[PDB]
Amino acid sequence: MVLYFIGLGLYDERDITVKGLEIAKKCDYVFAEFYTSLMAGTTLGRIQKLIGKEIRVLSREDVELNFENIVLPLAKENDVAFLTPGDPLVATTHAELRIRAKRAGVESYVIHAPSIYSAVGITGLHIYKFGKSATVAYPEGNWFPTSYYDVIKENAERGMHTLLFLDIKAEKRMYMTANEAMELLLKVEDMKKGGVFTDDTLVVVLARAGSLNPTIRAGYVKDLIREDFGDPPHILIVPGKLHIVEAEYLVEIAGAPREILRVNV
Amino acid sequence: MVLYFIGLGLYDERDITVKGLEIAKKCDYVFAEFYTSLMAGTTLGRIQKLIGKEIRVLSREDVELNFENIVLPLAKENDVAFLTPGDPLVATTHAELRIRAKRAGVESYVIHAPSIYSAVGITGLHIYKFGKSATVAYPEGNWFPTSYYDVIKENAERGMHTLLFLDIKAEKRMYMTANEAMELLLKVEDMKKGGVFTDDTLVVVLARAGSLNPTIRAGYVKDLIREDFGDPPHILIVPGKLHIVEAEYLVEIAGAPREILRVNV
Ligand SMILES: Nc1ncnc2c1ncn2[C@@H]1O[C@H](CSCC[C@H](N)C(=O)O)[C@@H](O)[C@H]1O
Ligand code: NA
């Protein structure tokens, strides 16, 4: 009679919370999705081992089109768990799954876990200063999407930081790198010429948030576009004007150039 | 000789990540602060009992002025942990403490935990749509804070939602309720008359996120300003233009008036 939406956290199998692990161990069935994101620091096997339950993996279609036929039926007579990387309900289409649950006479509860939305605080940028977020998508054929460029523009105009998620193709396990995202943005700037993203733009790169040894780098595009940030996934952040305290952290912790203390403050 | 910043999560001791627990159990000394937020579902004892360590609670002064004199000295010879509610670097000034660690020659690591910043996803509101955030601070003496009103106005104009952290006076065990925040906002509206926050403004209240049965309510100020949302902590959210699915969730899950389903595109 109960469906538990349980977050797996940021990077590996230990990023799930104590509450989440125990509840998962008490469930009769366990489902999971790895299409919105992937636990780059672990494997399905390790997650299964830690929880001690077999895990039924669901595709994007299984979820969006048949959640009520695959997951909800079982939850009507048992305790069911639905695991997602990060914090449940952050992925924009997940909140609606609780509506489906209610409609099926199934109670649902949410077990939170660390999300990149809050984890980016490790960059030293004040969380309250972040504005609208966007995802950088690869162009395709005749389609050249650039909305993410406008998001950066509207945020920075008001001193707000912009968190940029990078395109990902889970099935094919192909991630977009920060370096690639920067190239794309430089190309979008050359078209809209709005003075939003150039070689002189300051950016921050966060890789492997959640691991004990994440990669936090800050600096100008011209110096980071070819730098090696390590294994995916990467997160790109275009900061707005900085509070001196944020700048001091980027310099001391993310190896940013002293220059930002006078140029971006 | 290392310093670990470890988040405890939203509501109780089980909101700590598995990683956080394992590492905290093997630390020589454990410090913590409980003034930046309220974990309504647990006690120091339970947390100590969980990690199996005595915990020295530090006041805002001990931290902001003597962190390098109380905590860092031990981190040079032992493995020290600093515990905080939610995620340690979210809506706090704790990030700067890492700079102090560096300067004292102490290596530091950050272990995230569920934060209210991502937990807002449980309101049905698309998290990528949130704009700049703010805090509704209690007026003191003749000083009446009002900046948070402009943040709401600025976000709303661009169709972005606004997350409002609520004030806390730890040493007085006082935690601002969404009701109090609403009253303060109406007073500011009367003072500025921008038409930003009135009796007809739709708002969302999330209380005790992290608990199994949080209070999630959405509706017009006039109807919610006096409603009982339960014990703190509370956060108030002023949504911007809603997507149809956000509205459906607010109505089906947060009990919002069916009329909000009719969005003015
Ligand atoms: N479980 C919870 N439910 C509702 N609001 C919460 C909450 N935890 C924190 N808050 C809100 O956030 C304020 C503290 S701000 C500090 C936030 C913390 N580092 C985090 O990561 O969540 C509180 O006064 C309250 O308004
Ligand atoms: Na945000």
Swiss-Prot record, chains A, B:
It comes from the Archaea. GO terms for molecular function: diphthine synthase activity. It catalyses: 2-[(3S)-amino-3-carboxypropyl]-L-histidyl-[translation elongation factor 2] + 3 S-adenosyl-L-methionine = diphthine-[translation elongation factor 2] + 3 S-adenosyl-L-homocysteine + 3 H(+). GO terms for biological process: methylation; protein histidyl modification to diphthamide. Pfam families: TP_methylase. Its EC number is 2.1.1.98. Keywords: Methyltransferase, S-adenosyl-L-methionine, Transferase. This is Diphthine synthase. It comes from Pyrococcus horikoshii (strain ATCC 700860 / DSM 12428 / JCM 9974 / NBRC 100139 / OT-3).
